[PDB]
Design a protein around this ligand. Structure first.
Ligand SMILES: CCCCCCCCCCCCCCCCCC(=O)OC[C@H](COP(=O)([O-])OCC(O)COP(=O)([O-])OC[C@@H](COC(=O)CCCCCCCCCCCCCCCCC)OC(=O)CCCCCCCCCCCCCCCCC)OC(=O)CCCCCCCCCCCCCCCCC
Ligand code: BCL
Ligand SMILES: CC[C@H]1c2cc3[nH]c4c(c3C)C(=O)[C@H](C(=O)OC)c4c3nc(cc4[nH]c(cc(n2)[C@@H]1C)c(C(C)=O)c4C)[C@@H](C)[C@@H]3CCC(=O)OC/C=C(\C)CCC[C@H](C)CCC[C@H](C)CCCC(C)C
Ligand SMILES: CCCCCC/C=C\CCCCCCCCCC(=O)O[C@H](COC(=O)CCCCCCCCCCCCCCC)COP(=O)(O)OC[C@@H](O)CO
Ligand SMILES: COC(C)(C)C/C=C/C(C)=C/C=C/C(C)=C/C=C/C(C)=C/C=C/C=C(C)/C=C/C=C(\C)CC/C=C(\C)CCC=C(C)C
Ligand SMILES: COC(C)(C)C/C=C/C(C)=C/C=C/C(C)=C/C=C/C(C)=C/C=C/C=C(C)/C=C/C=C(\C)CC/C=C(\C)CCC=C(C)C
Ligand SMILES: COC(C)(C)C/C=C/C(C)=C/C=C/C(C)=C/C=C/C(C)=C/C=C/C=C(C)/C=C/C=C(\C)CC/C=C(\C)CCC=C(C)C
Ligand SMILES: COC(C)(C)C/C=C/C(C)=C/C=C/C(C)=C/C=C/C(C)=C/C=C/C=C(C)/C=C/C=C(\C)CC/C=C(\C)CCC=C(C)C
Ligand SMILES: COC(C)(C)C/C=C/C(C)=C/C=C/C(C)=C/C=C/C(C)=C/C=C\C=C(C)\C=C\C=C(/C)CC/C=C(\C)CCC=C(C)C
Ligand SMILES: CCCCCCCCCCCCO[C@@H]1O[C@H](CO)[C@@H](O[C@H]2O[C@H](CO)[C@@H](O)[C@H](O)[C@H]2O)[C@H](O)[C@H]1O
Ligand SMILES: CCCCCCCCCCCCO[C@@H]1O[C@H](CO)[C@@H](O[C@H]2O[C@H](CO)[C@@H](O)[C@H](O)[C@H]2O)[C@H](O)[C@H]1O
Ligand SMILES: CCCCCCCCCCCCO[C@@H]1O[C@H](CO)[C@@H](O[C@H]2O[C@H](CO)[C@@H](O)[C@H](O)[C@H]2O)[C@H](O)[C@H]1O
Ligand SMILES: CCCCCCCCCCCC[N+](C)(C)[O-]
Ligand SMILES: CCCCCCCCCCCC[N+](C)(C)[O-]
Ligand SMILES: [Fe+3]
Lengths: 54, 306, 246, 53, 45, 281, 54, 54, 45, 44, 43, 43, 54, 54
């Protein structure tokens, strides 16, 4: 576990960060979209329900 | 005017090229046929020689029987009238047996029996030709890409006529042997399964039929563009890269942002064409067996409003 | 088994469509990395390796054996434009053109570029020369079309630059490759057929003007042309459409 | 006053091509418009292929 | 080479990073005020 | 970020418009005068499709559609929510395609190669302009053009085809379909034949174009050659699109009825129209 | 921001000014079109209704 | 945390800045379009209803 | 403000003016088509 | 200074002076045209 | 540092003119927005 | 083996910065999850 | 088991890790989406139906 | 089975294990889906029916 630093001797640091940054953003976009799909977690229309904006 | 290298302005002809005998049984290979000046305006002028061995005999004689069986049925359907045969040539059809028989072989020769006979001749002729396609490459010590690419087209052929009719339980599901007949089958196949346009694999299969047309127009235009630098001989460009391959790559690098090599473009070409019939086989095999309405299935999968 | 879904609406048709997305992604990775066997790794504007190499890693080397004892080509491998590129950058920043430091056609830059290939003739399957003059090839004649031998050669300036002496033919392909044109200087140059327009009474070369035929690179053997000479001749002529049509 | 005429001719050369290309397309549209009205259309009006939206 | 793929030296990267974060803090400060104005106008919570 | 052999090819020249105003590369892409035009038209059309989605009320990409103006508007303008956005996106798409074709011409001049590629792309453009501009102009309204949706432009194809019965019976359709099938068959053969030569059996010398001719003469008795196959591939696709646009410029402008009835001119030729027997007699 | 001028020691003005010109005109047409599509802020029809032109 | 500046010894600032500008603008458009999509937060329709301009 | 003239030391004047003629004409065509579409400002009627 | 396109410092000022004078004169015609339409049919 | 070749004194002169055009551009847009918010406020 | 070219101490330093940013990103997400859970729990 | 470490002399470590990383991600996304499609384990709607959100 | 170990002289270990790795996973996934398709062995629908989760 301490020797996890040696993944950087195996994988090129440049490709890892581009791959990781894309992975994190696409994942975060995906999870924000799943909540928007559910009416029970769509925070935009929860506020409409709460504040009577319809 | 400017020469666009679409027709050969000058033809040069010499001794007939008899080919190379790597491992070829030189007995089976015939003699060189005639030279066509008309074909020489576009490509090579030499016709032949052709290798007709053991799988050539089996494929050509079975293919002859398939072709001749359908022809005699058309003469019977014309009442043995040469004028009526000419008139209704595109309307004659040899049809599979009625759905009442299912997959049974007990159908009369006029009610789907000759279809089974003709179908067997086609089964032997097409599959033997794949073996011949494989063996012709082997004798020259070449790769088997032609054999395996052909196997993709055989896949759709076997799905249409053999595999799916077995899975549907009746030969009546198969394709009739006719010109306007198999067009009606195609039109009616979509209507029975609810707008085949919404089959995801029919949609993908079309993406690669347009992609093949897009890719061969691109590749064919690219090579004729760099043909002035000896670009048509792609095989020697792979061994020793020249200015034709560099200009061809740098055109698509500056245009699209990515390019290919002289050898790698033919991996795009072969893979784009095999997916036309590889994907089409699955979409056809899924129709009726798994989905009996592609518009309703589409509605449950996005693709269409509720 | 219509309507049978393992979960939600995921039936056998969903398994097929989702399995293809995975297969297509693997195929696109394979097809792209098989196209990184030439021209990589990426360089800077001066020659040094760039700090960005792209999402796709380089593939593993493959060896091509050459059909007449011509050696083994392994790609991807060490690469170098083995020639004196005569260019000076027009800007310190990247992405801007490079201006020639002199005559562009002679120096071999821009649309007049050539690649330092193997300086040997191209061979057919029998080991002979793929391209050779028609008077040396036996049994070759002009089967159709205007025989472009003895016609004057007119340049893009509508001035005669010579007349055709022979046709260099591709023996196994059986197609004309070059026109050998004798100049008023008495020497002979090769012009690729794709760059000529054979009319009824002349051969018109739109690329070069009249006073440039004497500058076409020559060949070290009267009956043998090599890949290096082909690339210099083809590159020089086609480079005149830009640097020699003013 | 050569520079004033120089800049104007540079711009008028730019605007001339934009006009030349633009009014070249209108003739092409006008061509199919004329050929449309000399054919038996408007007596065989096809149905709407797509919902009006 | 983790000792620099881009040719920047250590001190040049520090200088470049200081200017970059200054723009990042300015750009985020505008977004904080923009969200503060929208939340007072029409809260989403 | 250049290919190892790219330095000697980046030279100034071969620009139809400008010369140094827009003569540079952004990464690997060449930014011409028409690269600026292509980006603007490509970007505006995309965001309009994104904007048309919020007017439609959906975010599923497979449900987003931009519909042409209704048949009541004829050949004039339309409101943006109804069909005005389609007309802007069609203009934006038309500008982006022609700029892309014109930008390829500048690349051909800078590399000194032939203009086969931009010429072949114009065939695609002319087929597209036939469906959205030329054919609707003849028929009289913008509402005959297809909508800009992933699955709704298929509904336009299906609905237009069945207006004339089975569209398989359009004679120019049959010719075009034949060219499309031949082009894909030849592409499979061309890729496989070159790959088999470059990648022989195992531990074997790379084959030669003399093996390529020999393979197809052994197989089918003829070989079009290395130059012939590339001319054929270009011409099959251009022919496929030419007869594609031909079959739709004659549908609804010259031919108005079922396409099945067309083939009765052959079956009712005077010298065999009355012979009894067969399918039609 | 006392040293934002260093951006021009990174990006060539010729490519920046061209890119910024396309962005500003793309953004302008984008917004002017957004208001036209919405009936609330279509100034061409607000005038038409205001002066009873229909 | 105090040695993040070494990201510039791995990625080129010219490609990082170009990607970031494209990403931030596209993210800005995506969020602005999402709000206009929702009736509850469409600022054009809110003022239309508030000031009675329908 | 008084140094905007240095825009002509960066871009080519003989090429900017040609392109600026194209831009001003296409913008003019764009607005006239929009005006021509609206029933109130359709002047060709 | 920069000399990207090869114009002297006093060459750019003279070209800009001519270009700007045409720009204002072009805008004067445009404002006249806009004022004519606004009198005929105001859009506000 | 110095990817484009301009020195410090050139960058500041280049950035001095750029910001002047920027503040000019925003000033016109500020007035345009103020006028439109007078005519038809969106808040 | 070492396929990239980084020496052992470079791998130590590259990991040290990466993990320092890895905790920062996960620290902010923990606070965001703890804030959303109070407002509207999913369990 | 004592000699399982030889696996890395047969296969490239760089290709194994990318192969496994993609496999693990897609498998976890598949299982998570399988539970979301089952109303018995959809944790988003379970909370909604428990806290009377709707 | 004493001489089974010579199977490896005939086949590459690399080509066999990839073929075995793909085959085992595809067989396993297929059987799991076949069980989910049958209502009698869907372990998620059984639990819902057992615990009254619908
Ligand atoms: C299938 C039976 C195998 C046939 C091919 C055998 C073969 O290896 O020949 C190689 C063939 C010739 O090899 P060779 O001459 O022996 O080699 C000479 C030298 O060694 C030099 O040879 P080479 O180096 O030129 O050949 C290398 C080539 C050879 O490799 C292949 O042949 C790959 C074949 C893949 C077949 C896929 C079948 C369809 C699967 C669809 C999945 C569902 C959708 O490598 C590839 O093409 C790799 C292709 C892409 C692989 C990466 C895809 C990853 C997927 C996802 C992974 C990550 C997640 O080369 C080819 O490229 C052929 C391409 C065309 C293949 C067509 C296959 C059609 C199959 C029948 C129709 C479909 C059946 C039903 C499918 C759906 C069922 C429901
Ligand atoms: C109204 C009808 C339906 C429709 C119904 C169908 C049906 C049914 C099918 C298709 C299929 C296809 N459709 Mg569809 N299709 C429709 C609309 C379209 C549109 C369009 C613009 O609207 C297009 C472009 C397409 C295009 C396509 C292709 C992508 C695909 C055919 C691939 C192919 O090449 O098979 C042709 C190639 C073969 C069949 C292989 C043949 C190879 C054999 C082995 C060789 C035998 C040779 C023989 C013996 C002759 C020998 C002669 C001598 C040697 C000389 N369809 C509409 C919606 N379509 C096919 C498919 O698979 O898609 C899922 C299919 O089955
Ligand atoms: C004419 C023979 C075939 C052909 C040839 C061909 N295509 C070509 C070329 C050639 C020679 C190119 O050089 C050019 C290229 O660079 O390819 C990589 C291209 C090209 N052909 C392409 C696509 C394409 N070709 C097709 C067909 C064909 N292309 C023919 C069959 C199809 C089909 C059948 O559907 C498609 C989708 C591109 C990959 C490329 C041209 C890229 C381009 O135009 O770039 C500039 C424009 C954009 C970046 C996008 C603009 C987007 C719009 C502003 C908005 C959207 C409008 C659109 C109409 C919406 C559609 C909605 C629904 C219908 C889905
Ligand atoms: C049901 C029908 C399909 C099954 C049969 C068809 C499939 C394969 C047929 C045979 C093809 C074998 C090709 C192997 C090529 C040599 C191996 C290779 O080239 O890659 C190897 C690494 O593979 C790696 O880590 C990646 C693999 C690591 C081990 C995991 C095994 C793969 C399973 C992953 C999930 C698959 C879905 C070796 O790296 P270097 O060289
Ligand atoms: C549809 O089907 C369902 C889903 C219903 C059921 C199907 C289930 C199936 C088919 C399940 C299959 C499950 C499988 C096969 C799971 C396998 C899981 C495995 C093998 C997980 C392994 C994980 C390994 C990990 C996470 C290792 C990580 C290692 C590191 C993070 C350290 C990196 C290594 C370094 C740094 C080595 C460096 C050393 C040197 C000397 C350089
Ligand atoms: C669909 O789901 C939704 C969208 C609803 C929710 C999802 C949201 C997501 C996934 C959001 C993701 C957001 C992220 C990751 C945002 C990241 C924002 C960042 C990183 C912003 C940073 C901005 C920094 C800027 C603009 C800095 C600019 C700096 C300058 C202009 C300074 C100039 C620099 C110079 C001059 C370098 C110095 C040069 C020398 C020579 C020293
Ligand atoms: C769907 O969402 C909607 C569209 C509704 C809302 C979304 C809105 C969004 C995403 C808005 C984004 C807005 C942004 C990022 C706006 C940024 C605007 C900027 C940065 C404008 C800058 C303008 C700067 C200008 C016009 C500067 C001009 C400079 C000059 C004319 C100086 C000339 C330079 C010279 C003379 C060179 C000097 C050379 C020497 C040697 C001194
Ligand atoms: C679709 O969205 C709409 C259209 C509704 C809303 C969008 C509107 C937008 C985005 C509009 C954008 C407008 C812009 C950016 C306009 C910019 C216009 C500019 C900068 C015009 C500048 C013109 C300058 C000119 C014409 C200078 C000409 C100078 C000369 C020709 C020099 C010599 C001429 C002299 C001295 C005049 C006297 C000479 C003679 C020969 C009479
Ligand atoms: C004057 O003319 C003469 C008489 C000299 C010769 C003329 C011949 C003529 C006019 C021939 C016309 C031929 C035509 C129109 C052929 C058309 C063929 C078409 C359109 C075929 C299309 C599809 C066919 C398919 C997909 C066939 C698939 C068959 C299989 C996949 C295998 C079938 C095998 C089966 C069903 C089982 C057989 C097994 C047993 C044990 C019987
Ligand atoms: C991109 C390649 C990799 C893909 C992801 C890797 C996993 C591949 C298998 C994914 C299977 C799960 O995929 C998921 O299946 C469920 C099953 O109904 C679908 O179905 C769900 O949404 C649809 C559409 O709103 C509803 O009609 C349905 O009632 C609901 O159950 C999801 O829309 C789909 O996202
Ligand atoms: C669809 C097809 C669109 C039409 C394509 C162009 C048709 C020809 O259109 C015409 O072309 C010529 C070049 O020959 C252009 O060129 C003309 O104007 C330009 C600009 O003022 C000047 O260089 C000169 O007066 C003249 O060459 C014209 O501006 C254009 O009106
Ligand atoms: C490039 C392919 C796509 C091109 C798209 C082109 C669309 C732009 C069209 C510009 C020309 C518009 O042309 C104009 O349209 C308007 C639309 O109300 C028509 O206006 C007509 O309908 C309106 C409807 O209220 C009525 O006032 C009246 O019947 C008539 O004026 C005009 O008769 C026509 O002259
Ligand atoms: C529509 C605009 C098409 C391009 C117009 C500018 C091309 C003409 C420029 N130039 C210099 C040749 O005149
Ligand atoms: C200030 C008034 C300006 C008037 C000139 C505007 C540009 C004129 C372009 C003329 C083009 C004519 N044509 C037919 C080529 O399109
Ligand atoms: Fe090729």
């Amino acid at each position: 576990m301490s020797k996890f630093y040696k993944i950087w001797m195996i994988f090129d640091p440049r490709r890892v960060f581009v791959a990781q940054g894309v992975f994190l953003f696409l994942l975060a976009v995906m999870i924000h979209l799943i909540l928007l799909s559910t009416p029970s977690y769509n925070w935009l229309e929860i506020s409409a329900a709460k504040y009577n904006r319809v | 005017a400017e020469y666009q290298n679409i027709f050969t302005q000058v033809q040069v002809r010499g001794p007939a090229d008899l080919g190379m005998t790597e491992d070829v049984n030189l007995a089976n290979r015939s003699g060189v046929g005639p030279f066509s000046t008309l074909l020489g305006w576009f490509g090579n002028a030499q016709l032949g020689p052709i290798y007709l061995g053991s799988l050539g005999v089996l494929s050509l004689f079975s293919g002859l029987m398939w072709f001749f069986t359908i022809g005699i049925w058309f003469w019977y359907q014309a009442g043995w009238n040469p004028a009526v045969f000419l008139r209704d040539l595109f309307f004659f059809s040899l049809e599979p047996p009625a759905p009442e028989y299912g997959l049974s072989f007990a159908a009369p020769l006029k009610e789907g029996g000759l279809w089974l006979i003709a179908s067997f001749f086609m089964f032997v002729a097409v599959w033997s030709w794949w073996g011949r396609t494989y063996l012709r490459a082997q004798a020259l010590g070449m790769g088997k890409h032609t054999a395996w690419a052909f196997l993709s087209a055989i896949w759709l052929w076997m799905v249409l006529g053999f595999i799916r009719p077995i899975l549907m339980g009746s030969w009546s599901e198969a394709v009739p042997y006719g010109i306007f007949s198999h067009l009606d089958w195609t039109n009616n196949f979509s209507l029975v399964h609810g707008n085949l346009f919404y089959n995801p694999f029919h949609g993908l299969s079309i993406a690669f039929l347009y992609g093949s047309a897009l890719l061969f127009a691109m590749h064919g235009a690219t090579i004729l563009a760099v043909s002035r630098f000896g670009g048509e001989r792609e095989l020697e460009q792979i061994a020793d890269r020249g200015t034709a391959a560099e200009r061809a790559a740098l055109f698509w690098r500056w245009t699209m942002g990515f390019n290919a090599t002289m050898e790698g473009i033919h991996r795009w070409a072969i893979w784009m064409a095999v997916l036309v019939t590889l994907t089409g086989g699955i979409g056809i095999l899924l129709s009726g067996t798994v989905v009996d309405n592609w518009y309703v299935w589409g509605q449950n999968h996005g693709m269409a409003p509720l | 088994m219509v309507g049978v879904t393992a979960f939600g609406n995921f039936d056998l048709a969903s398994l097929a469509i989702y399995s293809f997305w995975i297969f297509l992604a693997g195929l696109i990775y394979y097809l792209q990395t098989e196209n990184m066997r030439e021209g990589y790794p990426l360089e800077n504007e001066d020659g040094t390796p760039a700090a960005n190499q792209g999402p796709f890693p380089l593939p593993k080397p493959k060896t091509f054996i050459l059909p007449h004892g011509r050696g083994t080509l392994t790609v991807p491998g060490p690469e170098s434009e083995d020639r004196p590129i005569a260019l000076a950058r027009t800007a310190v920043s990247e992405g801007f053109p490079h201006a020639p430091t002199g005559d562009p056609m002679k120096d071999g830059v821009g649309p007049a570029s050539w690649v330092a290939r193997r300086d040997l003739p191209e061979l057919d399957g029998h080991g002979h020369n793929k391209i050779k003059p028609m008077k040396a090839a036996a049994g070759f004649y002009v089967s159709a079309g205007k025989n472009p031998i003895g016609l004057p050669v007119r340049g893009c300036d509508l001035e005669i630059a010579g007349k055709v002496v022979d046709i260099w033919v591709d023996i196994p392909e059986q197609m004309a490759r070059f026109l050998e044109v004798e100049l008023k200087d008495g020497s002979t140059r090769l012009l690729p057929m794709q760059m000529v327009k054979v009319q009824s009474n002349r051969v018109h070369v739109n690329a070069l003007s009249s006073d440039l035929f004497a500058g076409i690179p020559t060949i070290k053997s009267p009956t043998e042309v090599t890949l290096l000479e082909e690339d210099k001749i083809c590159g020089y002529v086609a480079g005149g459409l830009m640097y020699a049509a003013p | 006053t050569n520079l004033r005429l120089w800049v104007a001719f540079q711009m008028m050369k730019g605007a001339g091509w934009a006009g030349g290309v633009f009014f070249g397309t209108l003739l092409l549209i006008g061509f199919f418009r004329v050929v449309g009205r000399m054919l038996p259309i408007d007596e065989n009006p096809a149905p709407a292929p797509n919902i009006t939206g | 080479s983790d000792l620099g793929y881009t040719g920047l030296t250590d001190e040049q990267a520090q200088e470049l990073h200081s200017v970059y974060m200054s723009g990042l803090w300015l750009f985020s400060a505008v977004a904080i005020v923009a969200h503060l104005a929208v939340y007072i106008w029409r809260p989403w919570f | 970020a250049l290919l190892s052999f790219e330095r000697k090819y980046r030279v100034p020249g071969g620009t139809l418009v400008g010369g140094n105003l827009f003569d540079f590369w952004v990464g690997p892409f060449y930014v011409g005068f028409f690269g600026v035009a292509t980006f603007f038209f490509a970007a505006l059309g995309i965001i309009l499709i994104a904007w048309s989605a919020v007017l439609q009320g959906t975010w599923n990409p497979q449900l987003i559609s931009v519909y042409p103006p209704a048949l009541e508007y004829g050949l004039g303008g339309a409101p943006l929510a109804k069909g005005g956005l389609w007309q802007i996106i069609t203009i934006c798409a038309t500008g982006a395609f022609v700029s892309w074709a014109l930008r390829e011409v500048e690349i051909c001049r800078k590399l000194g190669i032939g203009y086969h590629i931009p010429f072949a792309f114009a065939f695609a453009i002319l087929a597209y302009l036939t469906l959205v501009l030329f054919r609707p102009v003849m028929m009289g309204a913008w509402g005959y053009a297809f909508p800009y949706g992933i699955w709704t432009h298929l509904d336009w194809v299906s609905n237009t085809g069945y207006t004339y019965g089975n569209f398989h019976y359009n004679p120019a359709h049959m010719i075009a379909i034949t060219f499309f099938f031949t082009n894909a068959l030849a592409l499979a053969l061309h890729g496989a034949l070159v790959l088999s030569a470059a990648n022989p059996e195992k531990g074997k010398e790379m084959r030669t174009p003399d093996h390529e001719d020999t393979f197809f003469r052994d197989l089918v008795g003829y070989s079009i050659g290395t130059l012939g196959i590339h001319r054929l591939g270009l011409l099959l696709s251009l022919s496929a699109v030419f007869f594609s646009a031909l079959c739709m410029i004659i549908t609804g402008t010259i031919w108005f009825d079922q396409w099945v009835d067309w083939w009765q001119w052959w079956v009712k030729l005077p010298w065999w129209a009355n012979i009894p027997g067969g399918i039609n007699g």
